[PDB]
Symmetry: C3
Amino acid sequence: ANPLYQKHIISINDLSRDDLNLVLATAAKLKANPQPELLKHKVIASCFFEASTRTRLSFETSMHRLGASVVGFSDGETLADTISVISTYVDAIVMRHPQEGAARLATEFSGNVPVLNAADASNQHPTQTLLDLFTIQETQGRLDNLHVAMVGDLKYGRTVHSLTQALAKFDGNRFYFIAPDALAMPQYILDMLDEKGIAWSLHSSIEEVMAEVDILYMTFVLRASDLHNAKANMKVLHPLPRVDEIATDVDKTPHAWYFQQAGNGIFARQALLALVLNRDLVL
Amino acid sequence: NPLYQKHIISINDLSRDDLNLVLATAAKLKANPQPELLKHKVIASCFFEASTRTRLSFETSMHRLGASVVGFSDSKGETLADTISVISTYVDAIVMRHPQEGAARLATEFSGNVPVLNAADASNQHPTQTLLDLFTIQETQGRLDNLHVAMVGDLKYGRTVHSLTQALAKFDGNRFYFIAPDALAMPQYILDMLDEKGIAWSLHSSIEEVMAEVDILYMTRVQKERLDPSEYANVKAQFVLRASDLHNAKANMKVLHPLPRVDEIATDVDKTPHAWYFQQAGNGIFARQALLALVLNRDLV
Amino acid sequence: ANPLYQKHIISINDLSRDDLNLVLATAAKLKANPQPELLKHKVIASCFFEASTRTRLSFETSMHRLGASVVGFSDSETLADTISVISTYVDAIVMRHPQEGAARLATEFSGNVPVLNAADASNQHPTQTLLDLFTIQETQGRLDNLHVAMVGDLKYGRTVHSLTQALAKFDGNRFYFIAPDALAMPQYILDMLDEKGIAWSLHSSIEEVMAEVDILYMTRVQKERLDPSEYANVKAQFVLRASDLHNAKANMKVLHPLPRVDEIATDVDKTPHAWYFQQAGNGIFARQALLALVLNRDLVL
């Protein structure tokens, strides 16, 4: 069947791998052959209770690229009543809310209208994880047997958490965690990896791993000089926004891939909307 | 149609025939959507006063008819007349909600052939709110005649009750039940209008008195700032609807509420078959669609 | 294949006389024969870092009139990164930013995505100059050999600067600068005009030029920009009344970039010379023409 048809996407953990591969294949096919009229008569609510211009513009561009119309707001009465009302207007609800659990709460009152969570919180940012994995698969050719380093604040970086857990669903990956000692990756994730035969290590500098990595996911400030011995296929990724952790001289190098990654956000979210609102895989 | 390029500023600008046409068009668009009726139209959603509820509903109506939307959600030597003079050269219709009463009517004076639709939901003129109320009543009851309709809450300042009672009074055989604190009773001119047309009505102090007789239960809030705290403590639990209160309700009965609600309807009502306020809000889509369709498209489908 | 394709439009001075004539002919062609699906499947970003309901509504209506989709914000991370990201989503960026360099800077990071400036900076309001030029050409039949008076604050009115510079690219225009001495047209513009042997003169009242002018371009005088000792130099001579038009030529048109305050009395509005609202409306076709030329290589209509 189509396993995502009219399913809620509130958390990345609600997706089996089979689901992940399906979303990725649809993302790639829509990237190759766009379906600008697939959702021609659908209306989608873009409800950003908490403002986030980048993510809203990406989501809404995805909607328009699929031919859907958009109503919405950025920034009283209970959230449940707001959702109970809106779900009578629209065909899907894309929502970002400052409170964790708000998206699931909306699913309790949205009826048959799917909710897609665009939050950045701990629970999930499923479309961000999907666009990360999609960028990795596009640039490396696969999601198995990869070398992935994660740099920066790994205790509060929720996208490294989700991305590590999703990558652990594929075989033969090796992880390198480079962070100050005060902000190490949580043990529950390291234990998740330990229980599988997945190899991981800690490092205090990127120079230790620079020659072996296929993906460098940023959150020490990275300069172009540091990339002297990188693999030709190596890509620097970043969920964005960045401040200083990537210096601007990285931008002109071939390894800089954070903006292309953001651009792939369009095809991840197009794939999610298409799969959730379209029965038939006429993609 | 009789409404082509008509302004919709007040429900009173509509004859009984105009009103029947709007309601019939709403029913037709709910049953058989016309998603490209307004394909090449551009509509301005001008919310000088913010209202997420109404804007999302109105803009959804616009998109369900295939129209494009430009607009603003809130807010120099700029003037309302000049602003309308400019905007009416861009777009094919102007949907506007403005904090001053009379502003939409004033705008029709500078819009030329561009129709203006008043998007207010609660002041002295909220035509699309009354239209969606009437549409919900007719859809769930089969008619707008010979009905038992109860109005509950602050009936002195609940203006949607004022509009709804006046609209229902244009039909035959309706009977009204007014449940309010004595300081918040229906305006005298409306009761006099009901007597002047020979419409039967009665006053009551609680929902228990009438629950078994009513086909429509239209709820309103009672704000504490309307009353002495004395009276409010004394009377507050008296105008709150809970599931328990519906034990002897007629099977056909529907609970309506213009929304938003606070406490005046407990959440245990949502789960009963009589809760219909969200469906009412949803019918707002088709009332507003019907207005846009009749105002911007000449020939009927 | 057209010369503006995928070009950034940041300043009016980036366009030759021939370019302007092409843009204006395109605007006229789109006004006469609408192309509602010319930009179908295009997605355009409307980025108003600084609010401007006027210009935003005009620009976005243009986008929708050509069939484009619109994503954006009206506001009130670095700009380069913001553009680097957004230019991966959309096919063009329409931009208004309070800082003078922001639109050029964005062009450095937008890749192949064209940037169109919607600012009101010094030389950074190209679509305002384009709609001015288009309105002048439409009502007078030409952009050559005109008598053009500019009234009001010519020192800080940046759109009179743009317009004077653009008309100076045509032959035989004659200029009338009517302003307080403290707010006179800047010397560098007069020097540019002297260098192209273009004739201009200063005058103290609208009545002096009324009988000769084809265009009366009005702006407001904000007396705050003056010394109190100069308040008396701003009396009635920079405000147009209907009475003032007794000896005006039949073809004369009164223009104004808007908003207006008192410098054009409302009794001018019903006269045939009032043309500021039609001008604002022509903004649609100037902006449509720019978007069409920038986003479509082969423009067949």
